Each structure stands twice: as structure tokens, then as C-alpha cells.
Design a binder for this molecule. Structure first.
Ligand code: NAP
Ligand code: NAP
Lengths: 480, 481, 480, 481
């Protein structure tokens, strides 16, 4: 029997006579949850409630915002396994990775609780020249207002947290539209926020609707900010239709990694390349898509990496030992199988995997795939790694940048000048030194260059986009 | 006499060739005083390609090189002070006092930038926030965004170009600037200064004064990583909608209000600042004090003193030292102000002074109790018109100040501690001016609007931030032997 | 029967064959606790253990320091009433004020836990001129090393916390010498720290010794910093004998308060002046010693204030209703009685109190006391308030500054320019606007000017004095 | 010829009167080249009273006024460049190349200060961290500390005075400067520049070059709120002990080591920087590379190349362009270095080059494997002597670098990422120089020592911090109507 969930409209749980949206177990492909489908009126009413709640949200004391975020931390810790099991069920990700996501979410809210009592301003001298004699200023930051949040399926809890936690830390009311396939994680967050008394009424609304019903999340003038996490083409089109509001875009990536050395050793290096290339079956925005290995290490790395790929346990995501579960859908898995076949037909040498069994697709390693192939050009978002050899370091950095994406890059080096050359010249938001590009700390500035997006997430950075600058220009204040 | 022939800038070099001429008129005599080469579609496309090609060299410059470029601009602006001021007055119609003031403001803008170019700090961040993240540390640095598209208005043809150009050089961003067709000379004199600086790489700048019908690329072209616009609200918001992937900075219009709750320090000084706010540059300012709210107990005393000071304002030739207000940018603009004054009076407003038009010249006007349905109250007037209102409750006056689709700046005259900070907290603007009119701006302050007045902030260190992208180096056990 | 406590030597509880130091109930004057007396060898061994523990303390991860501080927060909350009762017993302060001190201590450690994961550095460009081409720098902060801490009797928990919490937040080993009369609060802290596994061995030592045995805390070259909280003459002499080490001095005060308006009303104003003048029987460093009231409000304030002073409940500090308990000693109470008598003999008009009953001394208000009197010149540290009338605001600010102290000042004003004139011209570390000078937030920079001290406490500010700056000057790093 | 008569500064004015003369010798010819008035006990007492009296006016100055003062110093230093450089060489004995370099460094120090004077930022802090603190907010501002006592050494008589004087003016602190008796002219030329600046209040400065026996007040006097000293360790530490209540800044000696683990970018450049480190100003520097640690695999190649470069160094008249090293400050100082070289060799050290003395001149010396018991290894040499050592393990070389009671700067030549950051983490110094000798200093960097090398940091923005006191305005429900 499927579990009946509630949606959140103006901080309140609702179900009423709304039609049901089915949420399937991505492994068994059977309906495990029933979620109420929100209407156009529900969205319009949620936006009006957020506008009405904006003065009360802005009026809250720093300690009140802190108390709200600390209560979320407490409840997440208390419902840890329940959330992890739900995460695995609705996304198809292994249980160890689902537990990791709950731990990261706890850290996200904890950082936000600490940052809520730290929104500093400036006292600025304004008597920079003779005509400005007797002028001083106070620069303070104020909430932007109602926030529109649109999140993807791959991290249905932590990527919602990277939007929700900064909004509460600042005092911004919001309306969240989670991914239809993975809404449960966002709804459990709504269940936690609902029973917090310090959070004013209408501060939040969580409405899981399909993309053809969620147009207001983009265009509506009542939102002062749109924060989107998802695919590049969808995001860029949303920015174009957004109107006057500010925009934050967390989009796709085609992440490369340079291996110039083994740091600290070969076993650890391969263990981190495996993580980058196949964490969550490569269904990550910072998945290590491309691997560039120096010629003197090429054969030793190729042998060790391929052997480690073949050793990866694929199956039921509920099992502890499972490294990679199934893809979000059979359709997604078919697309990866097609792109692997095309890459091989275009000149690529298939080292391992490439075969499909329903929603399951084998961990794949393809050598020397040309730029004309979709597997090299476009974001794969699958358990596929593209192997390349290089002889000159400068040319490898140029190859890393030979993409329309620019999220993160990785570099394995014991060399001081190579490490800083890569930091200077890699056209990304984040350069990972002596780890794969798949590394993210929740406090770091995270975001992309080029088609990977605009602006930065990471709690204190996301809070900045949710804050507007105001200056009090004071003329001879203190003159009796 | 004979008009002065100017040169346009394409990939850091002056050009004229066989291009057709664009006439620049003396806004007072209405006679052609300058001839500017008209840039083509190919000229714009070539300027954008040169900026893309110059981006690696611009990014490779040392901080001292960027500072040296900006300090050379400061030196040359000081040396050509009167020449620039006379040109400014001629092409815009603003009095020489207000023009000299703009050159001084521009010198400070480049000077602030020179100092900020050697102060782009980064962070060393601990990343071992939890057990999972043991042995992690980070270096956060800021890098130039890339080619910048600049579109500037007519009213401050030098200082508002400086607020874009100076941060771009301070950061190391190549740019393509499209100044206003009516006022391009100020931007072209900047090009003449920049052209002589050897430290600034080739293709770092291009200054192409083209009409709005030809400047579509400045908005839509994917080769620009940022579009920074200063101008009218409807034009700006539409440019943001057509901009594509690039980041956007919007410095748009305003309907600035001012509360007079006390005389600070005295009545004479208060009136002197209110006059400045209401009639500096004949209200052809984005921070022009369009609305004046005076507490009932001071109302009659302020109304008498203010109106008497308005009637005493010297209007005429902007080249004369004593001239407080010159003509509007065009006769068409002056006619529109005359129409809105007439409509405001017909809708119930009480005309206290002015309201009459003599060609491009429009008398300093003060209209009492104009309703919200009138265009003079609803929309940005951008003329020498001040709307007078009385209030009894301070909280309600702040609510009235916020009763606009604009939100650039507001002003407040108060001796009260709690009123000063209540206004700072509740005024829906980018800047609250305390014991001065909303018409005050310091070139180092964060400047920009809320609502329809825009997005993002200018003021050198703030504009530089929009021209910089954040990059983090995440270090795993760096320093472990 | 008195409770037998343990002292802390190299993180370990010790008692052995050490002689006992008696701790009396400051109300009943009967021995309620027995504390082991530390020897010269104990102090020398504690300093050697701190030197030996400095590398391990410096090697700790930010999250480990955070975990230590969060465990202190948890334990303080769990032993709340026990600590409060102990605080009241050993100091003589009312129970409501003892509870307030435990709450402030919890906030101090909580701020320190948050600040431990926020020790930021800078990336600085160093190519400021042509000769410096290709230079860049990384500025980082490192622990100073072993810290010597000497704390007073009046806040035996929170003032120890304002030293201990920043030391742990930074990773500095320490040796604490609490006040002999009030050591229990510091020893309960030692009991909490002892059972924390993440804190290395030898990180702390709490040795309650008399002033004639604690010379090493001042002079010993093994300490890199001396942080003292206590009386001016003792502190200044300790700075003179300190040697090479850095010094932090939190000393006495003669705090004034200007009443130019009633903010928001007269009742609230008097309620805050009462707090300032008689919180903890004026036995505070920020006690409102001097009150300057504008002539137009003088009589209305004088009447309302005196009536509120006479209404104050004095007695058993264990009783809930008690506003002020007894003085630390009968000797201290006698000294206050002598200074009140002298102030009246020198021309002062006694409005209320002035009488002594053992260790108890009545809340006193003395009008127009001359500068030659000890009650006006020197820090009173008693329930005595000196009332003065003024006609000109500028002259009142000049009178506020007419002292050799400079800790905090207070100002009640509705005037914008008076508020900022006072901020600009009051020669203090803190100006309290629309509250008495007796207000302190644990996150604010706190300290004095003139004889009131040097440096600033308040968690993030105290951490700075416990950190040394190091720059990595990089020449063409990133050049292949 | 005839000696040049100089004037001392007392309460911003030049004075000579009937005061006895102090002779200043040309450190190369050993002949009297200048006559300086000797300040009295009353002169010092009067200078301190004038600084106390000038503190309110100094604190009242606008940020633009302080910047204007510093920019006028920059202009005058540029205008008198060669004159100052020649004076510097004459009174100190340093080569003209090193003197010109010091004037350029001083120009940058005042320029950094001019920019920092208009950038003293404060904070707006939320204080409602808990329920108890509801409605609390704070404004944290920094205010001048008050009168500053300055004591400077002989080796950099201009730049080290600038590192005290420039931050004091940038903040608005009056001061009394006691420069070294042997090198006072550089400080007196600064006084001549300052005296002509109208924006700087009267009594803001006094420059009194007196002998150490007469300058006790500079240490003990309670009218000074800060003592900033640059000089020898034993003198400084004793001054800190006698200072009383005032804050103290100590810039003392060093025994700087350098690790050569790789050639960066090549061997020639590495040797060129090691020579700079070991013999710039004949080792009469606080960041002189006294100790050189070379990895065993590079040892012989470096030892041969370094010794050959030492023998090629031009020693002689500091007024000559080609001169790398001039004479020591005195013949007495040179004799002491000769004695310590002789002792180092007698204790087991292998003399590779130099070690011979010709009056005030001492040959550039390189001594191999000198034991810890020798004075040349234990104590600061402050001469043209470099102690060569071989190492096999990097971790042990860092431990050897730290095997000193000093801790100013260290140097490291490495291409290795983890070695570079291991050294940054574990070197017990204020500054770690990566791919240069420890003798590198940028005037904007935080500069100072650990252990016996001092307390606090110089570098303009860091020195300003020690000259500023923190004040918080704690606001209870400000903005509540
Ligand atoms: N940069 C980062 O931090 C980050 C992190 C993780 C993932 N990603 C990127 O996200 C992608 C994977 O997520 P996804 O497959 O869920 O992406 P997606 O198809 O773009 O969808 C993301 C969200 O947008 C909604 N949406 C789609 N079209 C919409 C429209 N026209 N109007 C309004 N909402 C609309 C979706 O709703 P429905 O599902 O209800 O249709 C979903 O909630 C990859 O490209 C990955 O790189 C980026
Ligand atoms: N600025 C602030 O934040 C702050 C806060 C609270 C209090 N205070 C000031 O502290 C004073 C009240 O405290 P108190 O009466 O305890 O002060 P105190 O007599 O100066 O003693 C403070 C501490 O110093 C110790 N001590 C005294 N002489 C010493 C010496 N020669 N060598 C080493 N240690 C020595 C004491 O030990 P024994 O008790 O064991 O002898 C005690 O632990 C007042 O003046 C008050 O203003 C300042």
C-alpha cells in the first residue's frame, strides 16, 4: 500500500480533493507514495501568502531565524534513517550515498544557523574628497523578498537545502517547486518547518507540480528572485522568461580531471577517480566525465582504473554493498547506451561496460572519443568516463577548457606551479586539487562559468543573492 | 563658425575613414558644433571580436599596470579639465558649474578605481567544517568576467561612463561602450586619453556612438559576459529580457521623495539642499527630488521659503557662471514636462510657481497636492518640477515615500534618532540620504535601485564585483609530505 | 559537611596529599567546599604539559575544536541549576543573576564553537608596484601558543569562559588561575573538559592558588600570552613584570551615564538605571557609578530613582525575590561604608542608604560628590550611585570623560546628533545607547581605554590576540 | 669642503637656536659631512606636550585631509629623489643602487598609506545573537590611539621611519620620532617635507635625533599611548619591560634561514637571489639570509656557483654605481664580524671565501658547517657572512631553520606543492618567502617576528591597526518609533 503524503500551502499541510501524483520506487518501479497535485490557484495563493509574510519574515530577530534552522538540524538528525530510506526509494541512489546526502543536508542547515547571526554590514567613511566633507555611511543588507525555488531530481534533499536554508537564514519567504519524480525529501522538510512556531505563517509553500504547470515560478513579478538548479537548456530559457527578478542558475557540467601525479599514492588516486567517475552512477552535475592522464602514467592508471570499474557492485540500492543503483528511468539508461554506441562508432575504444539491462547500465570507460561525439560534447549524466592521454600539461588544461560547460575541474599533481597554473587557467567555478572534480564542501562557493550557470551557492554565498544592499548616507551626524 | 571633427574608437585606435557623419548640436544655440563618425554593423562586430581577443592579455596584466592606466587617466582629466567641462556644457545643456562638478566627480571615480585595482583580495577558507571534510582547505580568488557591453545615458555623459569604464580597467575586463548619440564627446575624449596609454593592451576598448536602432548587438551578443546599462526603465528591463545568458547590471530611473521632519542644522541650509535636490541640472537626474513631504507644523514656513528660493533661480545660457539651470536636452522633452504640469493642475494640483515653457526652457515648477492618477506623480518627471505634500504622521509619510514603482534614493531631514533609523529600515530604496536631499551621491558608496529602478550596485568597488567571477581552489591534504 | 572538589593538572583531576583551601558560602560565612591547594611544582608541571601539548592543539581540525566547544555547551545546559547554585554560594550573587551568568557562559561557548570553523585568511596581491611584479601572498593565522589566564571573583564563570572558549576555538593550550574565593565555577569547567576525548592531554590545567603563589602566571617565558581580568593596579604591575609575552588587560571602571531623554519612557529608563547602578550590588566592572541627569528631568528622575532604590530587596542570595545579596566580604562592605561617609563629609548629599549590617551594605545614592572624594575619583565596586545635574550636553560628555578609567559609558537620548556626538567623544571601549553602561553582549568588542586596560574580549576579538599572523610571499607561483 | 647645517623639528617647526651640534659623518670617507642640533630634555618634554595638545585636531581631520598630507609627501619624495638617495648613501654607507631602492620603497609606503587613510572601515554588527539580546545592534568604529613614540634604527633610516610615520598620519595620530644618531638626515628631510604641509596640524610631529642615554622618555612617558620600536632585540625587550601602561610594537633582529630544495626557475636565478639575500647591504639587514640549507643532491653544484658569485661581488665606494657592497656602519662593527668569523673557523667551521678586514670593509664571507655553540650561528651576525649547511631530509631542514631564538623570515626554493605548504605551516616566522631568499619584503605585506624577533606587525594597513582603538556603539531598539 502506498504512503499518502501532504503538500504545503502557506505553511499548512493540504491534500483535500486534489488529484494524486504517483511516486515510484526507482528500483522495483512500483508506486510507493501518493502526493497531492497542486493547482494553478494553489500556486497563485502560495505566492500571495509569501508576499503577505515578507514583512513578518524581515521583522524576525537573528536569534529567531537561528532557532528555526537549529530545529531543522535536530529533526533531520532524529529522522535520519527514515529520510535516507525515502531518498534511496524515490531517486534510486544507493543507501550509503542517501545517508551521505542527509549528513550534508544537516551541515547545510547548521552552517545557515551560524550565518543567520552573522549578517554584518559596514561603516564606511564617505569624506574621500573635499566636496564630500562631513559624510559617512552605514551599509546594511536586507532580505530581497519572495523567492522562487526550482530543484532537480539527483539530490532531492541537499539541493533544496542549499536554497531553503539561506532563505530562512536571511528572512525571505519562499515557494518551492521540487522535481515531480523526487518530491518526498522536500515534503519531509515541509513537515519539519510546519511544526516550527518561530517561523511565521505563509513563510513557505512546497508545491510538487509537473514542468507544464510551473510557469508562474519563472515569470511571476511577485517573486524578487528565481533560484534554479537543473539542466542547462531549461535554466537558460527560464532566465530569458524571468522578467525583472534576479536569477541564480546552477546548471550542468562536463567535468574533466588531470592526473599528472599519484597523490599521495596510486591506490588512493584510483579510489578518488572511481568516486568522481561513478558516484551515483555518474548522475551528478560534477561527475568526472573526462579523464586526462599523463603519458608516463597512462598504462598503469588505465589498467588500475578499468580493473576497479569491473569490481563495482551494481544492483538493489537498498543493499549496503551496492556502489551504483539504476538510472532515474529506463529512457535515461537507453540514451546513455545510444551515446556509448555512437562514441565507439565515431572511433572510440570501449575498455569496459556499455551494456544495458532495463534501467541498469554497466560502468563504462571509453578511450579517445572525438569532439564530434555526443558523449564528449554534451553532459553524459551516466556511468561513462572518457579516457585520454596527454604529453604536455599546458595542452591538457586547454583540453579541460575545451567545453561549453564550466562547473568544476580536478587535478592530481605534486607540482607547485602546475597546481597554481590550473587554478589560474581552468575556466570553472571550482578547481579540485588532489581529488576528482566530484568534490563539494557545503560552505565553499559553488557554481559555474559559461553554460554551467551564473552566481554561487554554498550557504554564505547564496545568502548574498537573497540580500539587497542599502546605504544610509549621513551628512554631519554627530554635529551638535 | 565651423564644427569640430572627432574620431571614434575601434580596437583601441581612432577611426573616421569613409563613414557617414553624425551631428552633435550645442544644446543651447541648437547649432551643429561637432561631427562624429557613424559606426557600422561591421564596426560593432569587429569591436566585439577585438575585445574577445584582448581578454587574455587584459586578464594577464599585473595589478600595478591596471593602477598605472587609471592614474594616467586621472592626470589627463586634470590637465584637460576646462576643455572637458566646456564640451560637457555644450553637448548636454547643463550649466558650467554642474559640468565642472561632473569632471571633479569623474576624477574621483578613476582615483577610487586606481586604488581598488591593487586591492582585489581573496580568501583563505578552512573547509574542514565537519569530520567528512577533514584535511580540506580553500583559496577563493576573483577573476575578470570577460568582455563587457556598456550603454550609458545623456544626462551625465562623463561620470556615468566612468562608473563603468574605471571598474572594467581596475579589474582587467575588455569593453565596448555605446554612449548616448546626443552626448558622445565626453566618452570620445576618454577614448583619446585611453588611446595614448601604452600599458593598456590593444583591443581593450572601443567607443562606438550609434543610434538605438543600430545597437542591438550590445544587448543580445553572446560574446559579452556582462551587460551594464544606465538609462530609462522601459528600455533597460526590455534589454534584460533580450540579454540571453550574460550577467546584467541595471541603473534605471527614479521618483525620489524627501521627508522634512526638522530643519538640519537650520531652515536656510535645509531650503538650500531642497533646491539642490529639486532643481540641480533642471531635474534631469535619476536622483532628482520629485516629491517633497513636509510635516504640518513646518509646512507653511517651508512652502514660503522654498517657493521664494525657486523664483530666485537663474535660468539661461549654461555657459554663464551664475546660471543655475540651463535648457532641457530638447524642445520635445520640455513640451512633455509642460503637458504633465498642465495635466497635474487639471487633476486637482495647485500650481505654486513656474509651469511656463519658452522653447527648450521650462520654468522651475512647484505643484501642491497632485493626485496619484496624474503622470507627474506616478511616472518619473525628469524635469524642473517638485511635487509638494503635507503630512501629519511620520510612519504614513514613509509609506507615501514608498508609494512608487521606483526605489533609487530617498531623503530625510530629522534630528530624531529613531525616525532616522526607522526610515533607513523601511524606505524601499538603495540609498537613504540623512539630512540632505535624495540628490546626494558619493562615487565610493553602493548606488542602485530597488523595484523598477534596477538591479545590482554601482560605486567603484561594487561595480568591480559584478565584473569579477569567483573561483575556489579546493585543496585536499596540501602540505602533507 | 563540605563538598570535596578536584583541581586540574595536565587535563587530569588531582587531590593527592595537597593541603586544602576552604571555600565559604558568602551568605552564611560557613565552609561549603574544600579545594586542593596547588604547589609550585604543580604550576611548573602544568606549564611544561601546555608547551608539550601545543603541537597537538595546533594540529587539531576546525571540526574537532568545534566538537569540544559544543560538548561544553551540552554539559553546561545539563548541569544548569547545579552551576547556578554553586555560583550564588561561592560569590554571594542572587540566584536570578547566577542563572543569567550560566546562560551568558552557554552563549560564549556557542559563539566560540561557531567561530572555530571560521578562522579566515587572506589572498593578497603583492604586485602593488613594478618592482613587485609576479608577487602574491597568503595571509593565515596560527595559534600564539601557551596562554596564562588570571580571572576575578565577580563573574567566576563567564569571565573564565571569555578566555577558555577563544583558546579552544583557536587551538591554544592554557593554564588558568581562578580567584581563590570563587574557584568552583572554573573547576566544574575542568570536570567538563576532562571527559572530552577530542581535547588533547595537557591542553588545560586549572590551579586555584593565592596571589602570593601565582607569580609564574605573570613572568614565565613559556607562556606566549597573559590574559588578565581583575583590578587596575594588580593588572598594570603584571604587564610591567610580564617579560616578552603579549598582554590582554581587562581592568576596572568608573562608568558614567547621561539621561537627556526617557527612552522609550520614564519607567523603563529608571528600571535600566536601577540595573546599572545596583546589578550584583554594584560589584561589576561596568557598574553605573555616576549618573548625569539633564536639569529639566532632574527632579522627576531623582524622585523616581530614589523610590526604586528603597524598593530593592536585599538579603539571602538563594531567594528568588532578592535583588542584591551581601558583598564578597565584610572588609569590602566596610570600605564602601567609609567612602560613603567621606563623600558626605566632603559635601555630598546622602539621598538614601549608606548603612552597613556585616557584609550587607544598603543601596546608596549620593548627590553632588566632589572630585577630591574617593567615591568619585576611584572605582566604587559597591551599591553606590553618584547623582549629578547638568545644563549643557557637551559639558556632561566632558564630565563623563573626567576619569582615569574608560571601560563603558551610557546615554539616554532621542536626539540623533547627541547619540553620535557621544559615540565620537566618549573615551571608552563601549558606548551604550538607550541603556545603562552595565550592558554587555558576549559577541561585542569589550575592553577599556586609559587605566581600564588594553585589547578587547568578546569571542572573535579575544581569538585575534591568541592568533599570530603568517604570510606566504609567493614569487611567480603558477609560472610553468 | 664644509658640513651642511640641518634643522631639528619641535612641534612641526624647524629649530637650531643655541643647541650644541651633533656631527654626522660620511660613512665611507669618515669625515664630518653634516651638523645636526642636539635636542635637550626640555625639547623632548615640550614635544610630548605639543603632541598631547595636537591629538584632538589630528583626530578631527577628515579622511581626505590625511590622504592629501600623504600624497604631498609622495610628490616631494619624487621631486627630491636623487638628493635623498645621495644623503642616504652618505650617512649609512649603503651603495647608491640600494639607497635609490630605499627611496622607491618609501614612496610606495606613503602611497599605500594615502590609499588606506580613506579606507578605515567599521562594522555594523547584529547583537541579537540570543533572546536575552533582542533589539540590540552595534556600530564598531576605530579611533586614533593618541600620541605615538617612534624609535627607528640606522640600516634603513628612511623606509623604517616611513613604516611608522605614514600609518600615524593615515590614522590621525600625533607623534615624536627619535631616529638613530648616526643616520638622522633621512628623518630630518621628512620633517622638512611635513613642515611645508598646511593640512597637517601644528604639533602633529617632532623629530628629535638624540643619543640613547637621553631618550629615556620615549620609553617610559605615560603621555604616549603607543611605543613603536625598530632595532636590536636586547634594547627592544628592555624597552617593552620599562614602557609602563602603553601599547608596544617591536620590530627586532633575525637569523634568517633559506632552504634550497630545487632551482626555481633555474640555477642562475636561484644563485642571484641567494646572493641578494646573503649580501644585500652587506648583510646589515634584519632579514639578511644568515643560514643556507642545500639538499645533498644539489649541494656541490650550489656551493661552487654561490662561492664563485661571492668572489665576483664589487666592494668599495658606495657612491659608485657598480658597487654591490660598501663599508659597515663603523670599524668597530666590522671588527666584531671578523672576530665571529675567526671564532666560527676555530670551532670547526670551514672558510670557503672572504673573512678578511680592511678598516670598515669586511670581505663577503661563506663559512661551511659552523656549530651551534659559535656566535656566528647562535646570534644575529648583521654582516656579509653566510653559513652553508647540507641536509638530506626536508622535515629535518625545517626543524633546523626553526633552531633559533629568532623568527622574522625564512626562505624556501621548491617546485614541490606539499613542501611549500609544509614550510608555510611549520616555519616559526612572520613571513615565509617562497622561491626567493628570506630578504624579500613588500611594503603592503604583514611584516614582523615570532620569538625574540618581536611582537605585532608592520606593513601599512597592519601598523595602522596598532594605532587604532576599537569603539562599539551598542544600540537598544534604535529605530523604534
Ligand atoms: N549545478 C548544480 O549544482 C546542479 C546540481 C545537480 C544537478 N544539476 C543538473 O540538473 C540536471 C538533472 O536534473 P533534472 O533532470 O531534474 O533537470 P531538469 O529537467 O532541467 O529539471 C529541473 C527542475 O526544473 C523543472 N522544470 C523543467 N522544465 C520547466 C519549465 N519549463 N518550467 C518550470 N520548471 C521546469 C523540473 O520539473 P519536473 O521534474 O516536475 O518536470 C525540475 O523540478 C543535470 O543537467 C545536472 O547537471 C545541477
Ligand atoms: N574589565 C573586565 O571585564 C572586568 C570584569 C570583572 C571585573 N573586573 C575588575 O576586577 C576587580 C574585581 O576582581 P578581584 O577583586 O578578584 O580583583 P584582583 O584582586 O585584581 O584579582 C584578580 C585575580 O588576580 C589574582 N592576583 C592578584 N594579585 C596577583 C599577583 N600579584 N600575581 C598573580 N595573580 C594575582 C587574584 O588571586 P586571588 O583572589 O587568589 O588572590 C585573582 O585571581 C574590579 O576592579 C573589577 O572592575 C574587570
Amino acid at each position: 500500500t502506498p504512503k499518502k503524503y501532504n503538500i504545503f500551502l502557506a505553511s499548512k499541510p493540504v491534500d483535500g480533493d486534489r488529484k494524486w501524483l504517483d511516486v515510484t520506487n526507482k528500483y522495483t518501479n512500483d508506486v510507493a507514495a501518493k502526493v497531492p497535485q497542486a493547482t494553478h490557484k494553489d500556486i497563485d495563493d502560495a505566492i500571495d501568502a509569501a508576499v503577505a509574510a515578507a514583512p513578518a519574515m524581515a521583522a524576525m530577530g537573528a536569534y529567531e531565524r537561528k532557532a528555526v534552522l537549529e530545529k531543522v538540524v535536530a529533526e533531520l538528525k532524529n529522522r535520519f534513517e527514515e529520510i535516507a530510506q525515502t531518498l534511496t526509494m524515490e531517486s534510486g541512489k544507493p543507501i550509503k550515498d542517501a545517508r551521505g546526502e542527509v549528513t550534508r543536508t544537516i551541515d547545510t542547515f547548521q552552517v545557515a544557523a551560524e550565518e543567520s547571526v552573522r549578517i554584518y554590514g559596514e561603516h564606511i567613511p564617505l569624506d574621500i574628497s573635499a566636496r564630500n566633507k562631513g559624510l559617512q555611511g552605514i551599509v546594511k543588507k536586507f532580505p530581497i523578498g519572495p523567492v522562487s525555488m526550482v530543484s532537480p531530481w539527483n539530490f532531492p534533499l541537499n539541493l533544496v537545502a542549499h536554497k531553503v536554508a539561506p532563505a530562512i537564514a536571511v528572512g525571505c519567504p519562499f515557494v518551492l517547486k521540487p522535481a515531480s519524480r523526487t518530491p518526498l525529501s522536500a515534503l519531509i522538510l515541509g513537515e519539519i518547518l510546519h511544526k516550527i512556531e518561530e517561523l511565521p505563517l505563509g513563510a513557505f509553500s512546497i508545491l510538487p507540480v509537473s514542468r507544464e504547470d510551473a510557469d508562474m515560478f519563472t515569470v511571476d513579478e511577485r517573486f524578487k528572485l528565481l533560484t534554479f538548479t537543473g539542466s542547462g537548456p531549461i535554466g537558460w530559457d527560464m532566465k530569458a522568461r524571468a522578467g525583472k527578478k534576479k536569477v541564480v542558475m546552477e546548471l550542468g557540467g562536463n567535468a574533466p580531471c588531470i592526473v599528472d601525479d599519484y597523490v599521495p599514492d596510486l591506490d588512493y588516486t584510483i579510489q578518488r577517480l572511481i568516486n568522481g567517475g561513478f558516484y551515483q552512477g555518474g548522475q551528478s552535475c560534477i561527475h568526472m566525465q573526462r579523464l586526462y592522464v599523463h603519458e608516463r602514467l597512462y598504462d598503469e592508471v588505465k589498467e588500475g582504473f578499468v580493473a576497479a570499474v569491473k569490481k563495482l557492485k551494481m544492483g538493489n540500492p537498498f543493499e549496503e554493498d551496492t556502489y551504483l543503483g539504476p538510472m532515474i528511468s529506463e529512457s535515461a539508461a537507453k540514451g546513455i547506451e545510444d551515446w556509448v554506441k555512437e562514441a565507439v562508432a565515431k572511433g572510440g575504444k570501449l575498455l569496459t561496460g556499455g551494456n544495458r539491462k532495463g534501467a541498469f547500465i554497466e560502468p563504462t570507460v571509453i578511450e579517445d572519443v572525438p569532439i564530434e561525439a555526443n558523449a564528449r560534447k554534451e553532459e553524459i549524466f551516466g556511468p561513462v568516463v572518457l579516457l585520454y592521454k596527454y604529453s604536455d600539461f599546458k595542452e591538457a588544461v586547454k583540453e579541460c577548457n575545451n567545453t561549453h560547460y564550466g562547473l568544476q575541474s580536478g587535478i592530481f599533481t605534486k607540482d607547485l606551479n602546475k597546481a597554481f597554473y590550473a587554478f589560474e587557467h581552468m575556466e570553472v567555478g571550482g578547481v579540485i586539487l588532489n581529488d576528482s572534480p566530484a568534490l563539494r564542501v557545503d560552505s565553499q562557493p559553488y557554481g559555474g562559468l559559461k553554460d554551467s550557470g551564473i552566481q554561487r551557492e554554498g550557504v554564505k554565498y547564496a545568502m548574498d543573492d537573497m540580500l539587497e544592499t542599502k546605504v544610509l548616507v549621513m551628512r554631519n551626524v554627530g554635529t551638535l
